[PDB]
């Protein structure tokens, strides 16, 4: 506290000196204890305990004194109660550094976001709002004559109120002479609008209309003719026509918002005047007129705060003259008229208002609009989990002292204890307010006090409290007799849209609203229920604003096109000759189509053509970006399509993603697994880099692979040192721009599920504030080029707060057709060699066309030949597609994804081409010709489809897939009558060969008859060893699942040990498994080598690869939001090929690491099913029990090895084994797990 400020010592001279003395003694004791850090030496210090008790006493006293000073400062200027202790210290301490106060003005005041200072920062010239709007003080306040923050800040507030009052007085003076005219010049009207503030212009229009109506009624009460009201209505019509003509043109955004507010107000004024004319109101005291909000302006009043009176029904208020800046004007729908009447009636009786109803009806918005209409500072308390309870008593004290309104958002969602505490505080405050209503109470001296924070606080009469409720529950019992409740059951969306469209220049606003509102109702009802579907009134407002923007863009386009040629331009003529329905439908589709799933798009278009008949959507193509996308997709072997062509939907999704990036700063891709999200944003980034010339850098930051503290950073509780988290470090590195990072497009992709733990701190980032707050206190402003991106699978565990804060493109699984995946595989095979390691890898980047390097390696030639051979099988109506479609019908032990099977098949075809290469290298004299290569490739293709699609299923269903293949294929198959085709293998020669030819009847010796390191070869054993070799030569995170004891780990070890290059690190997982275990395994068996390219994690043993056996992938427990943390870490570190450190916060790239693991069926208890995003890379093998014949063979060999000890008993080797096998089978089919959970009978028994 006393070191982070420069003026803090001046304000508390006794205190600062006291702490300084305490600090000198404490530093002396610190040096003394540092000399002898031993505890025994510490306890032997002469009188350390007495001095320490003295220090504790004094430190507590100065801390209390500091609190008392802060309380005095708050009480001497009420608005500091709205801002925290640390920020209070920052404001009071940085008196000379006035520029540091600019970031707290948005909390103390309503619309005040900055202060216009002088050249030397000694005189506050005026106030600047958040939108850049400024108010110039009539008499500027001088900091020099009032050095204390208190006095000059209070003078700022007071003279701001005074200058607003004077501005309103002269504004009324101008709008009077505006009103008393049958024709207003648009130029002078626009000059008046620009020259004054939006709030003040709106109030001036309201005052002028109210006084005109009052005078008209007064004249009518004596005359009896309706002419004055007709004149007033005609004047309002003329003003609306002028405003519409002006808003049709091009205006600056501030003047545009002023025009929108004026149109919204004058529409309501015209409606009220029409109602008065129709009702035939003659006297000014009729309730048909008294019920409307009336404004009375008397400049003769000496006090500015009492200059303006706002009266409706019985209640009459005084304008608080709080400066609100450019707020959002409410439409004044009749439901809000009922709201205004009820709330003002409640405040007249000194009761708080409690509107209730479903969300989205505009409860807190209506309360805030009512507060702003009276010019009262209104705070909205979001009652969600972002609840600031500890400082709310201070906030209520501030509301009492300054006269600011306070509104809660959803009072029922508070927890019971917070609800009770806030209810008690509100009850005390409301009783204090009701004490103002006693007629016998003296008004000359009215010291009304309320008990808050164990002290008496004066409650201003102007302050009020609103509690917004939402049934489905009701107000607390103590607050039921003090609050007037109101039912916000249904907003009048038709009038909402009609007025807002009329304010946007749409001539046919009524028809468009009457069409758009039921259309949104149909979108809510007919369309499939999704979490991210927002069809409330806010979405409708945003869509209508976007439609207005599109219409203005069309008008500007037509005007520029005409000015390019030799014809004149008339804005009204262009606007008249313009289809509004097409603009509205284009806006709706642009806003809503990307958010929709594949099946809902035809539903959207059907409903949209039903409501809007005869109009169509024309897609806005981007030819330059289209060509760039085509070039980039060709560069990295993707399939590209236009419109209905194959790949057209994916390109459309990429274009929608580009639009969302242009519009929003935060956005999400919420496509299911294996839909093309990563490739979409990668190709978009590279296409933008190649088009705009701005280098694009992406920071894939997995949010769940590391803890929240490791992601955001944690502060040391003792030494108060701040450690930057991964996201915070990345953001700080971008902001600093030591290497020109502000000149490059940074995309912070998260690539992980979203849950409401690590997105809580991102809420401020995703807001319009674009600010990041840290526990230390530093505030990080999001640079314009930084684009927060989320690449998630679903939204099952995401709050509405983070979803509504960002744009979204849904990448439905129908987007990624199997044809383009096949084309990608074929192109990658035809271009990317496999024998290449570090060489021929960067050379692909070096070669834009790779001319002259076609016959670089015989590997490339043979894989081109193989791809040419298998091309007729990977077409749309091909063998592989039909096999995949059939296998989707088949059931699998793990849930089945298309890309898992496709990746497994691609890997085994890669192994087929590598086997061809090996045979070619072993036969230099006769290389394999085209015919033998074709035979082998077709045979291995059938084999690979069979072992990839059905590799996860069980035996007879594997035979089912095999017979399906046999009836759908044309390649010759084995001709044996009654043998499964999976039993056959493919040799180098074209013909098949049974696996039994590779199953020798070995003879184990007497010893090690049952030793663990004994693997008697069987059909299943040899097939699985071959499959393991195939999937380990590709270095994939292969996964084996099966019933316990089936032989998973054994066969994996047997297959892996045949390769003298990989060492297995067995890791056993369970419910307590965390990525920290993998980190310890890494730092034990590996080291972080500092390669110049980047930090590389490699095993200590050079030349030998590392395999990490994870015995149980399933057991790690799902979190409360699912998505096992270690599984997500493994996914990130196998897909992106690396992970982020927890100390340095730099990318680490793995080298020579594999992640082969074992599992159990998910149907077994405690086996959590694996996520699709992780299962996509990993192939899965079903290692079932050996079965009768395999058991007989293996254990006959074992029993022969046994009874070799006793020569006489060897004759009983096979009967004994047969007895063992039959007894085991009978026991296994007798004691099912249903009877008892421990009745598992594995070959381990």
């Amino acid at each position: 506290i006393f070191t982070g400020s420069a003026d803090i010592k001046h304000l508390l001279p006794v205190e600062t000196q006291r702490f300084q003395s305490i600090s000198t003694e404490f530093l002396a004791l610190m040096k003394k204890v540092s000399k002898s850090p031993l505890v025994m030496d510490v306890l032997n210090i002469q009188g350390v305990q007495r001095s320490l008790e003295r220090l504790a006493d004094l430190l507590g006293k100065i801390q209390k004194a500091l609190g008392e000073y802060l309380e005095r400062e708050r009480s001497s200027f009420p608005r500091f109660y709205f801002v925290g202790d640390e920020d209070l210290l920052e404001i009071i301490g940085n008196s000379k550094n006035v520029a540091k106060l600019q970031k707290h003005f948005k909390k103390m005041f309503a619309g005040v976001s900055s202060i216009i200072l002088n050249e030397d920062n000694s005189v506050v010239l005026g106030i600047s709002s958040r939108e850049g709007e400024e108010v110039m003080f009539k008499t500027p306040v001088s900091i020099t004559e009032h050095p204390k923050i208190n006095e000059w800040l209070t003078l700022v507030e007071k003279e701001m109120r005074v200058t607003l009052a004077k501005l309103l007085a002269e504004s009324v003076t101008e709008v009077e002479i505006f009103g008393k005219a049958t024709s207003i010049d648009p130029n002078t009207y626009i000059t008046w609008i620009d020259k004054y503030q939006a709030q003040l212009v709106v109030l001036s229009a309201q005052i002028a209309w109210s006084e005109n109506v009052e005078t008209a009624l007064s004249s009518m009460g004596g005359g009896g003719d309706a002419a004055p009201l007709h004149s007033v209505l005609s004047n309002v019509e003329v003003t609306l026509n002028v405003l519409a003509d002006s808003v049709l043109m091009e205006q600056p955004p501030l003047r545009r918002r002023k025009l929108e507010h004026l149109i919204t107000e004058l529409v309501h004024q015209r409606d009220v005047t029409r109602s008065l004319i129709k009702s035939k109101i003659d006297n000014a005291k009729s309730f048909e007129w008294l019920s409307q909000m009336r404004f009375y302006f008397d400049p003769k009043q000496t006090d500015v705060l009492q200059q303006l009176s706002i009266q409706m029904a019985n209640a009459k208020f005084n304008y608080g003259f709080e400066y609100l800046g450019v707020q959002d004007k409410l439409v004044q729908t009749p439901l809000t008229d009922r709201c205004y009447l009820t709330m003002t009636q409640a405040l007249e009786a000194r009761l708080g208002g409690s509107p209730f109803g479903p969300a989205g009806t505009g409860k807190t918005e209506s309360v805030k609009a009512l507060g702003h209409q009276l010019g009262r500072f209104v705070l909205v308390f979001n009652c969600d989990e972002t609840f600031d309870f500890q400082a709310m008593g201070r906030i209520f004290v501030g509301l009492c002292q300054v006269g600011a309104w306070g509104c809660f958002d959803e009072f029922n969602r508070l927890e019971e204890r917070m609800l009770s505490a806030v209810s008690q505080q509100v009850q005390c405050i409301q009783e204090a307010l009701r004490e103002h209503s006693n007629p016998n109470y003296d008004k000359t001296s009215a010291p009304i006090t309320c008990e808050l924070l164990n002290k008496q606080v004066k409650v201003s009469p102007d302050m009020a409290i609103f509690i917004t409720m939402n049934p489905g529950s009701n107000l607390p019992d103590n607050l039921k007799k003090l609050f007037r409740s109101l039912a916000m059951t249904k907003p009048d969306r038709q009038l909402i849209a009609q007025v807002m469209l009329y304010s946007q220049g749409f001539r046919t606003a009524e028809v468009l609203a009457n069409k758009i509102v039921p259309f949104f109702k149909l979108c809510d009802e007919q369309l499939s229920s999704q979490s991210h579907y927002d069809f409330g009134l806010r979405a409708l407002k945003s869509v209508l604003v976007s439609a207005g923007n599109v219409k203005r863009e069309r008008i500007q386009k037509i005007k520029r096109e005409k000015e390019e040629r030799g014809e004149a331009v008339d804005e009204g003529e262009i606007a008249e000759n313009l289809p509004e329905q097409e603009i509205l439908i284009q806006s709706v589709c642009e806003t809503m189509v990307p958010k929709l799933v594949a099946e809902d798009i035809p539903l959207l278009f059907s409903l949209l053509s039903d409501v809007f008949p005869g109009v169509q959507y024309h897609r806005g193509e981007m030819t330059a970006l289209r060509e760039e996308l085509k070039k980039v997709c060709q560069e990295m072997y993707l399939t590209y399509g236009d419109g209905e062509e194959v790949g057209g939907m994916w390109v459309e999704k990429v274009l929608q993603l580009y639009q969302i990036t242009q519009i929003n700063h935060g956005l999400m891709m919420v496509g299911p697994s294996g839909s093309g999200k990563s490739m979409a944003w990668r190709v978009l980034l590279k296409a933008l880099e190649r088009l705009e010339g701005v280098e694009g850098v992406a920071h894939i930051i997995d949010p769940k692979a590391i803890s929240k503290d490791h992601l955001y950073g944690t502060l040391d509780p003792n030494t108060r040192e701040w450690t930057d988290g991964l996201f915070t470090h990345v953001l700080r590195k971008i902001i600093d721009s030591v290497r020109g990072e502000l000149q490059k497009r940074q995309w912070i992709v998260f690539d992980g599920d979203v849950d409401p733990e690590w997105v809580e701190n991102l809420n401020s980032v995703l807001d319009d504030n674009k600010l990041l707050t840290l526990p230390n206190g530093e505030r990080l402003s999001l640079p314009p080029n930084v684009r927060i991106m989320f690449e998630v699978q679903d939204l099952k565990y995401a709050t509405l707060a983070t979803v509504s804060r960002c744009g979204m493109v849904w990448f439905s699984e129908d987007v990624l057709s199997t044809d383009m995946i096949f084309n990608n595989f074929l192109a990658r095979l035809r271009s990317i060699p496999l024998d290449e390691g570090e060489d021929e890898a960067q050379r692909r980047r070096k070669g834009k066309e790779d001319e002259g390097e076609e016959a670089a390696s015989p590997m490339l030639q043979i894989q081109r030949d193989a791809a040419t051979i298998m091309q007729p099988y990977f077409t749309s109506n091909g063998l592989v597609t039909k096999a995949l479609e059939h296998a989707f019908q088949l059931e699998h032990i793990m849930d089945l994804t298309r890309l898992r099977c496709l990746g497994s098949l691609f890997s085994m075809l890669h192994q087929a081409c590598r086997n061809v290469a090996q045979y070619n290298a072993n036969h230099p004299d006769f290389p394999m010709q085209i015919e033998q290569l074709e035979r082998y490739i077709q045979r291995y293709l059938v084999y690979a489809i069979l072992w990839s699609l059905s590799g996860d299923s069980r035996l007879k269903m594997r035979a089912e897939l095999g017979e399906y293949i046999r009836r759908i294929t044309t390649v010759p198959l084995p001709t044996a009558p009654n043998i499964p085709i999976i039993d056959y293998e493919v040799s180098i020669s074209g013909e098949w060969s049974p696996w039994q030819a590779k199953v020798p009847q070995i003879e184990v010796e007497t010893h090690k008859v049952a030793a663990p390191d004994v693997v008697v070869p069987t059909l299943d054993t040899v097939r699985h060893e071959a499959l393991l070799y195939t999937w380990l030569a590709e270095h994939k995170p292969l996964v084996l699942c099966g019933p316990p004891g089936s032989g998973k780990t054994m066969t994996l070890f047997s297959a892996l040990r045949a390769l003298p290059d990989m060492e297995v690190v067995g890791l056993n997982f369970s419910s307590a498994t965390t990525p920290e275990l993998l980190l310890k395994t890494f730092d034990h068996y590996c080291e972080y080598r500092r390669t110049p390219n980047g930090v590389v994690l490699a095993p200590v043993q050079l030349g030998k690869w590392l395999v990490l056996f994870c015995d149980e992938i399933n057991l790690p427990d799902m979190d409360k939001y699912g998505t096992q943390r270690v599984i997500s870490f493994i996914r990130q570190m196998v897909e992106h090929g690396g992970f982020y450190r927890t100390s340095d916060q730099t990318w680490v790239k793995l080298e020579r690491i594999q992640f082969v693991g074992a599992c159990n069926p998910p149907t077994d208890p405690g086996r959590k099913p694996l996520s699709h995003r992780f299962l996509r890379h990993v192939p899965v093998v079903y290692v079932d029990y050996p079965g009768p014949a395999s058991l007989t063979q293996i254990y006959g060999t074992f029993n022969r090895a046994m009874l070799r000890l006793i020569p006489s008993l060897r004759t009983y080797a096979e009967p004994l084994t047969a007895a063992m096998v039959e007894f085991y089978t009978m026991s296994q089919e007798r004691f099912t797990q249903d009877t008892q959970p421990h009745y598992i009978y594995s070959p381990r028994e």
């Binding site: 009447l341 005390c428 069409k515 059907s606």
Partner: protein
């Protein structure tokens, strides 16, 4: 059943006002039954024949068993003297629970005045209140003083501490603690268990309500000039009494039980005072024309009372009351507060202009209040009585619940036999997908089939576990408890159902819905798409009937190429069987009309409980700017009898000379299901 046809005098008893008094002999028995047997047999007969008089038969059955005067002592007012002086221990707190909105401290005040024992009354809810309560209790323990602690329901924690304190005390014989409170679940169970609970309900009756209101308002406030204020207050009190009594007959009177309490009364009184003072300017008398009737009506309809009203039709009904009562014609000597009390007698406004005359008039009201006083139909009392009878039977059945594997097994087997097996999903055709009706029916059949397979799997697994062959998972144990206890399982609630619905009724309606969906699927398979337009579907049977209305609108708009926003619904009731359907007309079955009869598509008021519309036809015609006629009334179509879900609002035309205000006040509405 045979005896029903053989008795010619059955009609005079069935339609009798009090059939339960004289139940004719209709049972066959071998030996003449004892009087208790006669009572129970007649109770069953009344339950089957006239369930509304179930309570009345119940009282005589209790009288036959336990003596006539068993319930007599309850009717007499509660005597505090003997119950407090005797049979209550000094350490037992007297918990005077009351229905919210009605106080009970006055009874204890009168008791203390009669017993000439000084007493202190303490409010609860504030810290100094707690301190004063503790000090007064401590003083009373050592001095034998009575202590009141008002509104103790606000502090459950302090209630637990107070109960703990009262457990460990040595109270004096004259000491006694009175805890007045309101009905609220937040209060501790231990305090209720250790106290002599007393329930103080407000006495029902319009007369009692207006006496309470007039006693609450001080005489000086009413006596304030002008003298028109007394009549204004009497009108306000009458209106408050009408709505408060109408709250009882729900949902017929009010679509839901709103919280029309004393706070609204005080707010309305303050509004009347302020506006009458503003208009009067202190004059001793003002003409009734000059009274701001519009201001009072608007404030009492939008803010004072209509703030808590969310349903549009309840707001319309409140507007009807306010426009009928608060008018200049109210000051006329022949003004009729209520019309058609018994068809002949009409309650008239008292001619007096003073508060004492108004009190004298209200005290002279006959003690024969009927729902027609409130504007409700006379059979509303019958509906309330039969609802109370059903609730009383359910309450005793829950009481009697305090082995079952075979009963659950046979119940589940019967349910599985009753419920149909399978639903066939509609086949997706490229031509059929464009039809909105086909899309809606496809969604219906898909979600209904999902629910059907879920329910059938659950029931079959319940049958298996009741056979002792399957383990009990958490979902299973929960569902078994729900079925055994009778609560509808939460899993089988994917479509809106009436609140407090037993599982058996849900199963019956589920089977009916799946039968209807099977018929729809068969028709769609047979005809493809033409038959789906010419199918008569019950709106109650459909899971989301508003989606059906939307689908009909969409189909009409698409077939005739009109825009969807230019279509309005016209309802025609045709009694002919199999009436022809126009190209833009859809048949509807099962609609039930409440409180009216429709003849030639023309409403007429009736005293029947409900009237079944033979064949409703919904037609979508192009919107016309022609003004609505004065004889056209808008009726809500509630999903069920609870009147909690609104689907669409039909329009109908009034027959002969019937006032639409009566239609609004009588609670006339259409129900998709009964």
């Amino acid at each position: 059943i045979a005896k029903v046809q053989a008795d010619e005098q059955f009609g005079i008893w069935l339609d009798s006002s009090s059939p339960e008094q004289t139940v004719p002999y209709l049972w066959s028995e071998e030996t003449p039954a004892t009087p208790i047997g006669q009572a129970i047999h007649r109770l069953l007969l009344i339950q089957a024949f006239r369930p509304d008089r179930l309570l009345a038969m119940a009282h005589m059955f209790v009288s036959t068993n336990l003596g006539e005067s068993f319930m007599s002592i309850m009717e007499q007012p509660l005597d505090l003297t003997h119950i407090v002086g005797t049979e209550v221990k000094p350490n037992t707190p007297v918990l005077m629970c009351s229905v919210p909105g009605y106080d009970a401290s006055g009874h204890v005040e009168d008791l203390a005045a009669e017993q000439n024992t000084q007493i202190t009354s303490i409010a609860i809810g504030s810290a100094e209140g707690f301190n004063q309560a503790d000090k007064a209790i401590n003083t009373a323990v050592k001095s034998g003083r009575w202590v009141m602690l008002k509104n103790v329901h606000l502090a459950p924690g302090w209630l637990m501490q107070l109960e703990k304190k009262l457990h460990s005390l040595q109270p004096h014989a004259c000491f006694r603690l009175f805890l007045t409170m309101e009905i609220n679940p937040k209060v501790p169970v231990n305090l209720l268990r250790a106290g002599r609970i007393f329930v103080f309900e407000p006495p029902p009756g319009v007369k009692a309500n207006m006496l309470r209101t007039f006693s609450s308002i001080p005489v000086s406030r009413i006596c304030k000039s002008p003298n028109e204020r007394a009549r204004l207050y009497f009108l306000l009190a009458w209106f408050h009494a009408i709505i408060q009594e109408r709250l009882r007959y729900a949902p017929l009177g009010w679509s839901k039980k709103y919280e029309f309490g004393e706070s609204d009364l005080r707010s309305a009184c303050d509004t009347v005072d302020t506006w009458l003072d503003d208009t009067a300017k202190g004059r001793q008398n003002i003409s009734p024309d000059k009274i701001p009737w519009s201001a009072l009506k608007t404030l009492m309809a939008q803010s004072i009372y209509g703030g808590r009203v969310d349903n549009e039709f309840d707001q319309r009904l409140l507007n009807t009351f306010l426009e009928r009562l608060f008018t200049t014609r109210s000051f006329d000597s022949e003004f009729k507060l209520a019309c058609k009390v018994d068809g002949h007698k009409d309650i008239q406004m008292p001619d007096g202009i003073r508060r004492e005359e108004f009190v004298q008039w209200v005290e002279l009201l006959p003690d024969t209040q009927t729902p027609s006083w409130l504007g409700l139909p006379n059979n509303a009392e019958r509906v309330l009585l039969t609802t109370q009878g059903v609730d009383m039977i359910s309450k005793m059945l829950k009481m009697q619940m305090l082995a079952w594997m075979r009963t659950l097994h046979t119940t589940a087997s019967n349910w599985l036999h009753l419920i149909p097996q399978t639903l066939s999903h509609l086949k997706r055709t490229v031509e059929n997908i464009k039809d909105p009706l086909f899309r809606f029916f496809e969604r219906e059949v898909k979600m209904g089939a999902k629910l059907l397979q879920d329910v059938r799997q659950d029931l079959a697994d319940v049958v298996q576990v009741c056979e002792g062959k399957k383990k009990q998972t958490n979902y299973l144990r929960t569902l078994i408890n729900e079925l055994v206890k009778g609560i509808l399982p939460r899993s089988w609630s994917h479509y809106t159902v009436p609140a407090g619905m037993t599982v058996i009724q849900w199963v019956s309606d589920f089977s009916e819905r799946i039968k209807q969906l099977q018929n729809i699927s068969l028709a769609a398979a047979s005809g493809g798409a033409k038959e789906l337009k010419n199918i008569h579907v019950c709106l109650g049977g459909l899971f989301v009937p508003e989606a059906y209305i939307t689908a009909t609108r969409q189909y009409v708009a698409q077939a005739n190429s009109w825009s969807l926003e230019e279509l309005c619904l016209e309802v025609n009731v045709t009694t002919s069987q199999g009436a022809t359907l126009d190209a833009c007309s859809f048949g509807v079955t099962g609609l039930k009309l409440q409180g009216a009869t429709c003849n030639n598509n023309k409403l007429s008021l009736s005293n029947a409980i409900s009237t079944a519309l033979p064949l409703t036809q919904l037609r979508w015609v192009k919107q016309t700017n022609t003004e609505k006629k004065a004889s056209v009334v808008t009726l809500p179509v509630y999903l069920n009898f609870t009147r909690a879900d609104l689907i669409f609002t039909v329009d109908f035309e009034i027959a002969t000379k019937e006032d639409p205000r009566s239609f609004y006040e009588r609670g006339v509405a259409v129900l998709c299901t009964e």
